[PDB]
Amino acid sequence: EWQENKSWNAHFTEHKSQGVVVLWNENKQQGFTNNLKRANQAFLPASTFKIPNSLIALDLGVVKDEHQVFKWDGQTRDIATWNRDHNLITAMKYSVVPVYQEFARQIGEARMSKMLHAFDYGNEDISGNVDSFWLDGGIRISATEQISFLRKLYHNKLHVSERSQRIVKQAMLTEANGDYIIRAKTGYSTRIEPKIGWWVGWVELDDNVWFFAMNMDMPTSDGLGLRQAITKEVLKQEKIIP
Amino acid sequence: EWQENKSWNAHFTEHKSQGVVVLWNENKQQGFTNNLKRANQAFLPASTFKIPNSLIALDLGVVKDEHQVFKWDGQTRDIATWNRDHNLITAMKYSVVPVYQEFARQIGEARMSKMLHAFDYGNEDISGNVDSFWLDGGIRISATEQISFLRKLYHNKLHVSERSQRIVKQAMLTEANGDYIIRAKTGYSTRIEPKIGWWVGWVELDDNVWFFAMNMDMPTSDGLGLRQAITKEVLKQEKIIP
Ligand SMILES: CCc1ccc(-c2[nH]nc3nc(-c4ccc(C(=O)O)cc4)cc(C(=O)O)c23)cc1
Ligand SMILES: CCc1ccc(-c2[nH]nc3nc(-c4ccc(C(=O)O)cc4)cc(C(=O)O)c23)cc1
Ligand SMILES: [Cl-]
C-alpha cells in the first residue's frame, strides 16, 4: 500500500533540484513517496550496483573477505580516493569503480546474468560491456525496485550465502549513533543522460526498519551532497530520526 | 612496545576522575596508556562480559540470531530501557542484564567455564551465581587483557563459528560516520568495590584499527557518560579521530 506525500517536494526545490524519495515502513508494510511516477521510473543503478556486485563476487570467491586487499593499478583517475589500495569496505565507501569492474570481469557475463536474474534485480539485463554495463549499459532499476531488492538483502533471502549477505551489509555501514543505523549505498550515473544521483538503503531503529531509495537530477558533481542531505530532511520530517 | 603517556591524565582530572585508557595500534603492534599499572589491574568485567556471553549463547543456540526476541518478564527494574522486549542488538545497546542472566542459566556453569577457558578470558573463573558471576562473582579482567580478547574477536580467531563472531561484532556497533567506526561495549560494576565504569572495543579506520579498553572510578551513575567522553578526548589528542 502506497501513499504520496508531495510536501516532501519542498526539500528538493529548496536546493532547486528534482527527484524522488521512497520510504518503506517494514513493520507496517507501508510505502511513502513524493512522486509515485518517478518512484517507478527506471535508471542505471550506477554505483548502487556495487551492492549486488559485492554479493556476487563474495559468493563466487572473487572476493574472499572484507579484509582482502585489491591493490591500485597505478592508473590516476579523477577521484583521488580511487588511487590507492582498497578492501571491500573502502571500495564500497568511496565507490571505487575500477575495483568493481575488475570483480565483474572475473565474475563474467554468464554468472552475472544468472545471479541478477536470481536476485530479480531491475530489468535483469546485463547488456553491454561486462565491466561497465551498470554505468552505461542496459541494466535499469527504479527506486521501488531498489527497495524490493534491499528488503531481501536485509532478510538474508537472496539466493546467496548468509555470510556474503552479512558481509555486504557490514560494508554498507554508512552512519551509526544511539538513535539509528544507516546501511546504504550512493550512486552517480554520469555516462548517460539524464545524469542522476542515487542513495538507497535502510534506517535501523530499535524496533523498526525503514527502507529508502532516492534519486535526483545531478547535472554536476557539486550537488552530490544533496542525496544524503535531502533524504535526511525527509527522514527528519517523518520523525524517523531526530 | 608499550609507552606510557600521562599527559592523558589531564582528560581524567578535567572531570575530577581517575582511571585508565589503553590504546593498541594494530598496524604497528604498539600499545599506549596513561597508567601502565592500572592497565594491568583486573576488575569485574560487568556488562563488558556481554561480549563473550553473546558469543557463547549464539554458538550453542541459546540465541538463534540477532533478530530473535526476548520478551520482557514484566518485572520492573531500575533501568527503564530494560523493561521492554529486546533482541540481541538492543540488549547489548542498553546492557539489559536480565536477558543475559537468562542466557547464563541456559548456558550453565559447565559450558560457561569451558568457553571462557577456550577464550583465555581474564582469570577464566566463574565462581558465584551462574547468572551473576560477571557482576558479583570471581571473574576478573584487566584493560590489557580486554584488548587481547578483542583482537581475537576482531580477527575471527576465537573458538566459536565465524557467524557467531560476525553477529556479535554487528551487535557491538556503537558509532559510525565518514571518519571512523566504533564497535564497543560499556560496563558499570556497582555490586562490589571499587565501583568502576568500563568502555572497551575498537575504532576502525580506512587502513588501521585502534583497539581500546578504558576503566574509571564510578561512584555514581552520573559520571557514566564520561566513559565515552574521556576516551574520545584521548582519541582526538592522538589524531585517531577528528
Ligand atoms: C568512461 C569515461 C569516464 C571517466 C571517468 C568518469 C567519472 N568521472 N567521475 C566519475 N565519478 C563517478 C562517481 C562519482 C561519485 C559516486 C558516488 O557514489 O558518490 C560514484 C561514482 C563515476 C565515474 C564513472 O566512471 O562512471 C566517473 C566517467 C566516465
Ligand atoms: C542485585 C541488586 C542490584 C539491583 C540493581 C542494580 C543495578 N541498578 N542499576 C544498575 N545498573 C546497571 C548498569 C548500569 C549501566 C550500564 C552501562 O553499561 O551503561 C550497565 C549496567 C547494572 C546493575 C546491576 O544489576 O548490576 C544495576 C544493581 C544491584
Ligand atoms: Cl556492522
Author numbering:
A (entry chain B), B (entry chain A): 24 to 265
Please give the exact wording used by the authors of the publication that reports this structure.
Prevalently, drug-resistant bacteria produce β-lactamase enzymes that hydrolyze and inactivate the β-lactam ring, thus preventing the covalent inhibition of essential cell-wall biosynthesis proteins, named penicillin-binding proteins (PBPs), which result in the loss of drug’s antibacterial effectiveness. OXA-48 belongs to the carbapenem-hydrolyzing class D β-lactamases (CHDLs) and together with its variants represents one of the most severe threat of resistance, compromising efficacious anti-infective treatments. Isolated for the first time in 2001 from a patient in Turkey, the OXA-48 enzyme is now widespread across the world and is commonly identified in Escherichia coli and Klebsiella pneumoniae. We then prioritized the 4-ideneamino-4H-1,2,4-triazole (SC_2) and pyrazolo[3,4-b]pyridine (SC_7) derivatives for further investigation and demonstrated by biochemical and X-ray studies a reversible and competitive binding mode within OXA-48 active site for both series.
Importantly, the most potent representative of the latter series (ID2, AC50 = 0.99 μM) inhibited OXA-48 via a reversible and competitive mechanism of action, as demonstrated by biochemical and X-ray studies; furthermore, it slightly improved imipenem’s activity in Escherichia coli ATCC BAA-2523 β-lactam resistant strain. The overall density was unambiguous and both chains included the carboxylated form of Lys73 residue. A salt bridge and hydrogen bonds between the positively charged Arg250 and the benzoic acid moiety were observed. The carboxylate group was also oriented in such a way that also Lys208 participated in an ionic bond. Additionally, the distances between the carboxylic oxygen and the hydroxyl group of Thr209 and Ser118 below 3.0 Å were consistent with the formation of hydrogen bonds. Moving on the upper part of the binding pocket, Arg214 established a salt bridge and hydrogen bonds with the 4-COOH group, as well as a cation–π interaction with the phenylethyl moiety of the ligand. The carboxylate group on the pyrazolo[3,4-b]pyridine core was also involved in a water bridge hydrogen bond with Thr213 and Tyr211. Moreover, the central bicyclic aromatic system of the ligand established a π–π interaction with Trp105. Overall, an unambiguous binding mode was obtained consistent with that seen for reversible compound ID3, where dianionic moieties clearly engage the positively charged Arg214 and Arg250. The obtained crystal structure therefore proved compound ID2 to occupy OXA-48 binding pocket with a reversible MoA in line with the aforementioned experimental results.
